[PDB]
Amino acid sequence: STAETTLDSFFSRAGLVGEIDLPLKGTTNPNGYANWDIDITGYAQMRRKVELFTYMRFDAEFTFVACTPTGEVVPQLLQYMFVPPGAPKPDSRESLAWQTATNPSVFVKLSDPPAQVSVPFMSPASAYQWFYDGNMMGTFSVRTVGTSKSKYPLVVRIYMRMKHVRAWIPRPMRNQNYLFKANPNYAGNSIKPTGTSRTAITTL
Amino acid sequence: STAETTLDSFFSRAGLVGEIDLPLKGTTNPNGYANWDIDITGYAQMRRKVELFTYMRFDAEFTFVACTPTGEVVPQLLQYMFVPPGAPKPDSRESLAWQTATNPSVFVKLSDPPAQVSVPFMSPASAYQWFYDGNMMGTFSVRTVGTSKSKYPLVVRIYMRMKHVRAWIPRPMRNQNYLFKANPNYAGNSIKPTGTSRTAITTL
Amino acid sequence: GFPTELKPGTNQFLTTDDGVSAPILPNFHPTPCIHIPGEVRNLLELCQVETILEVNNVPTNATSLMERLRFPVSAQAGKGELCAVFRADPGRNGPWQSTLLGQLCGYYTQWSGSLEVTFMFTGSFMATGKMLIAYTPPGGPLPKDRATAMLGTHVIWDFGLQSSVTLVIPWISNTTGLVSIWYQTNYVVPIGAPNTAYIIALAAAQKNFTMKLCKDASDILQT
Amino acid sequence: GFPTELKPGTNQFLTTDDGVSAPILPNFHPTPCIHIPGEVRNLLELCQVETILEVNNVPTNATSLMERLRFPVSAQAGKGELCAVFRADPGRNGPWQSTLLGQLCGYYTQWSGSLEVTFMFTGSFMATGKMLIAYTPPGGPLPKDRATAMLGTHVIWDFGLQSSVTLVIPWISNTTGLVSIWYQTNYVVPIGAPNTAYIIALAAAQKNFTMKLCKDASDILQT
Amino acid sequence: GFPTELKPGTNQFLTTDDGVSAPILPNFHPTPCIHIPGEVRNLLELCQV
Amino acid sequence: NIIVGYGEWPSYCRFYTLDTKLWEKSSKGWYWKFPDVLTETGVFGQNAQFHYLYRSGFCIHVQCNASKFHQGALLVAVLPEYVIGTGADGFELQHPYVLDAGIPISQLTVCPHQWINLRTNNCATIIVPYINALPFDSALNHCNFGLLVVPISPLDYDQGATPVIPITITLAPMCSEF
Amino acid sequence: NIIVGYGEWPSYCRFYTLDTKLWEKSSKGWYWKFPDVLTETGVFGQNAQFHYLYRSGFCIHVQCNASKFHQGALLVAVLPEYVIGTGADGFELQHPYVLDAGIPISQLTVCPHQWINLRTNNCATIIVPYINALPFDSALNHCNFGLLVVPISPLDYDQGATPVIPITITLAPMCSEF
Secondary structure, eight states: OOOSSBHHHHSOSOEEEEEEEEOSSSSSOSSSEEEEEOOSTTSTTHHHHHTTSSEEEEEEEEEEEEEOTTSBOOOOEEOOEEEOTTSOOOOSSSOGGGGOTTSOOEEEESSSOOEEEEEOOOOSSSSEESOOOOOOOOEEEEEBSSSSOOSSOEEEEEEEEEEEEEEESOOOOOOSOOOSSSOOOOOTTOOOOSSOOOSOTTOO | OOOSSBHHHHSOSOEEEEEEEEOSSSSSOSSSEEEEEOOSTTSTTHHHHHTTSSEEEEEEEEEEEEEOTTSOOOOBEEOOEEEOTTSOOOOSSSOGGGGOTTSOOEEEESSSOOEEEEEOOOOSSSSEESOOOOOOOOEEEEEBSSSSOOSSOEEEEEEEEEEEEEEESOOOOOOSOOOSSSOOOOOTTOOOOSSOOOSOTTOO | OOOBOOOTTOSOOOTTOOOOOEESSTTOOOOOOOOOSOBOOBTHHHHTSOEEOOSOOOOOOSTTGGGGGOEEEESSSOTTOEEEEEEOOTTSSSGGGGSHHHHHHTTSSEEEEEEEEEEEEOSOTTOBOEEEEEEEOTTOOOOSSHHHHHSSEEEEEETTTOSEEEEEEEEEEOOOOEEEEEESSOOBOOTTSOSEEEEEEEEEEOTTOEEESOOOOOOOOOO | OBOBOOOTTOSOEETTOOOOOEESSTTOOOOOOOOOSOBOOBTHHHHTSOEEOOSOOOOOOSTTGGGGGOEEEESSSOTTOEEEEEEOOTTSSSGGGGSHHHHHHTTSSEEEEEEEEEEEEOSOTTOBOEEEEEEEOTTOOOOSSHHHHHSSEEEEEETTTOSEEEEEEEEEEOOOOEEEEEESSOOBOOTTSOSEEEEEEEEEEOTTOEEESOOOOOOOOOO | OBOOOOOTTOSOEETTOOOOOOOSSTTOOOOOOOOOSOOOOOTHHHHTO | OEEEGGGOOOOOOOOEEEEEEEEOTTOOOEEEEETGGGSSSHHHHHHHHSOSOBEEEEEEEEEEOOOTTOEEEEEEEEEESOOOOOOOSOEEOSOGGGTTTTSOSTTGGGSSEEEEETTTOOEEEEEEOOOOSSSOBOTTTOOOEEEEEEEEEEEEOOTTSOSOEEEEEEEEEEEEEO | OEEEGGGOOOOOOOOEEEEEEEEOTTOOOEEEEETGGGSSSHHHHHHHHSOSOBEEEEEEEEEEOOOTTOEEEEEEEEEESOOOOOOOSOEEOSOGGGTTTTSOSTTGGGSSEEEEETTTOOEEEEEEOOOOSSSOBOTTTOOOEEEEEEEEEEEEOOTTSOSOEEEEEEEEEEEEEO
16 A cells, blocks of 8 residues: 555665676686775666666665576685775785784675674764765675685676665656766767657658 | 355466476577566466456465476575566666565575565456467566576476455357467367267166 | 473375465555455255256257257147156256256265255246156156056146246255156147247255365366 | 475475575674665555656657657647647557656556646737637547547647646546547737747646556667 | 474584583683782773773 | 345445347256356446446346247356456357366356246346556456356247247446446 | 755854856756855855865745746755756756656655745745755765755746746755854
8 A cells, every 4th residue: 555655665675786607717817806895886786777766765685696607506715804984994815904804804605594683874964965066885795715816717696675765855767878986977969858759740 | 054155265276387497508588598588378277267257356366396307305595586567677687677675585595495475466457368369477487596507407386375365257168179379260270069969868 | 391292193294285475565555445246155045056967968069059958849749658867866967967056966986965946837828738857866766657656746737827837856965766758648739839949947056055075076188 | 304296386486485594694793774865665656646748759860859849839829729639548659658657667567547638828928818628538439520529538728817727537547538629719819929839738646546467578778 | 203394504513603502521620810909890990091 | 035145235345138049949058247248238348448447346147038848058157357268249168168268167157147947947147347457447458257047948839830939138336447 | 935954044063145047948956066056155155165174055046037927936945965867157967857867756846845926926945955964064065965956847938928937946044053
């Protein structure tokens, strides 16, 4: 009963944000680690939905699914360390940031159910704002446990769900194509109508 | 005590509806995906049982069993995405429908207990009707997780159980063989009696 | 830290198991149910409805299929002569396959209760005569003549007095009882009226009928 | 020692599942929330807000894009002549794509309720005239002339008496109704005043509007 | 016979998780605590010096 | 007698006499569709095609007059959503055994029905409420139910008597809404 | 009439008349930024750049005087955190259709807004409370909101009449804190 249009229902599903490749050989990540800055716009449809308002406040829930490029399941161990905002990030496999006790880690196996954690509201202000006339959530670092390189190629996929959603000050929805990230810039030489057109005003 | 003839008892068991083949090589599905429209008549005996009434209303429960053609169990990951009625269906492995957050998915392994989900009553009207003088439930899309083809042949079997059954307006049971789907057409050149015959009315 | 044990029936899928699963679409609101007349909650309600019994299941032609719904009573048949005979077995092959009770009990394995058969005379208003309807319990043979059938459970039916008669069959279960119809008198009719008539038989079940152990058992092909 | 069973939905990840996970940072205290004005908790509040309806979605040039927000009413058009016509379909392609109601109902699958359209006249203070606004229910064709449209749901709008008029559209769901505007009289104006004016249309939803079965469905590219 | 589900965070070790483990030495009695002066329970007490 | 379909009277949310069917010695049966049968007749017919949503009940009387030297029997029944497999004058059944839809006629007594025995009575009345999965529908695109009149026992008589028996159907809308 | 933004009056935790804009037949629209527009004006302007933390509400009056033979319509609206995509005199909109930021003008009525119809009225009043994610901010580095005045219906008149219409904006700080 009008409970599908609430904001909690509007933002209620886990969507794929981000993907990490750890190839056996190549140039994508020569080592066995990667850094992924947390963002909600990894999901393609998220930006236009969130930018309907000016201020937002929510928690997050992350799930990690790992497998071989073909989809196989292999006996491997991973780390999944979380770097809070304002803290240094790893630079190599031998970096000392991988064992700093203030960065929580989740040791898990591939032959296991996907890992799941929760992240609270991490802003100094009272809400995130997508427009500032004048939003760091953290970082996830993924590696393979060991002093030697792994024997398999791996892919990690991250899914995020938002909980306890609140919003303020609605705005008009986006009309033109985006050009940059965190920028309302638009192609000024090609402006398109909001919808379709017809031949005359007197004809259906 | 007369509790085996209720409608809930009459429709109370999980039966095999549908089967999906994902061969290593051949022409059945050249890619690693398939689409199965939800129907209750995949079970051979279901049509004549349901068509005893005119209107029906129920929920559903689906279970997926996956294995190799020989019956072996292998380390593979699958998706099982559900497409609600009124939504576009996948066209390829690289289609963007596989990651739309409004189509729920169930990531699972072959070396796991069979997956199980529930589907509610999805009709705009108040009940399904098998006869209309003048019933879309959804779609299940099955694929193998990965950007490359799998290393094994696979088969997926789907079982469905109906819950909270209600019915109205009983009808005579079907007498002749069916010819089409959602069509009461019959072979008019070969009409058979409802039962067996005997030599004379005075002999047992 | 709660200890567990993981009993030996752990990762198994039993098709007759009943439980609760995870809903795939929460926050979805199904259409509320309006009132529709004619709701059925038990199959015995359908079993207790009279339907036509094809006693005359002799013909098999396509154009003679409607002749199986009645059997004749003519004016050239003498007194004391047998008219028709059938068993009292709803779940077995024969005349009962045309009734809804037989079709519905073909979906189960065991049954027991009482039945009733109704006969309807569709002759002219000026025809008269008498019939004898007899019932023989299980284990007995067919009576050799009308006099033997008279010494037993029977009823005398008069065309002039009544147009319909009923015959309650006592307990049946799971040999079966027999029902036979004899001529008591001849077929009396005035001048100007047809010499032949037909009888329609209707059969149903009583309120103490039950069924058990559902089967599926059917031979109609989907496509 | 507690026995368990491990049902057949055990090690599965359903993206629409709702549960509780392990917090990664206990002992952390988030910033307390101050009061910010303008909190919205349901989308129907946004759906119930009037926005400009582009009835005149004919032009497509970059510099003529602002002409789509109004349609003219001139002094060289005779009486009884059709001015403009549009459908009553918020969720389909057409004029309604410019309103917030259409954009918001493009995120769902089903909808039903009542609407309302408001027309505003922006001519001079000395101009007078009359208009006829008619509504045709679903399944009917467009009226052939003003007289045919008079025999139905309609309103007569007087420029001198009023500057705005409203038209409540009854139930819509999921063919659609039609709205057409006719000339009743001619455009009367004194000497020294412009011969042409424009009308602005605003559309919104009533309090019985609902939406269901969320979709995502969008074609604006991130980068 | 109690059914279970085994949610997707099952066999994972989170270093910031708080729980109860199995004591390795039951029946052992630690030394009772005597009173020692100068107990500090919060760091702001040190910050205010 | 009078029977009420499913034990429900028509509720809220004149007489029309059609032409006469001639029952013969070789007749098979006829059927009519509702509310198609009353769409080109009178004020009801105008309202049916001049509106959008329709909802109504019905009351059907079937009569036949014959002499005391005629014989036969008819079955009158109402079947909602009567889809046919392989106007105001109705159609004729091609294969009455399978009801022209693949279902047996012997089980047609599961629907609201009546019997006409020429030696016993000559009238049959059925009252039909509104049956649908939606509160309102379209009167020009959806047929709610159908009416069947099938001779189970053939008509017979002697030579020199009238060889055709008239069957007249008269119906009256009840609790109609538009 | 007078509208109160989001139904909140300014609270705690003189008149300034700017120059006149000349509305023409080819005008596109103008906008002003707050509190940038009042940073070089008077005691408020001195306090804005001579302090560290600022917090204030506002009350905005927009007026225009024209004859009875002129026509046109304006939309006046307030948009918090108005970032522009591709002083006290304001700027001019280059692409008024996309509000110079990629968003449609047809949905601008979702913000605190008013209409000016030359045939009906000539005044519009908007009251804006303090909107921010923090109790205090900087008056020289953060612009809280922006004010828009866009002609939806073009200005028209006959030859011989005055070809420019004056639009004057007067504003008064409310519940200001420094």
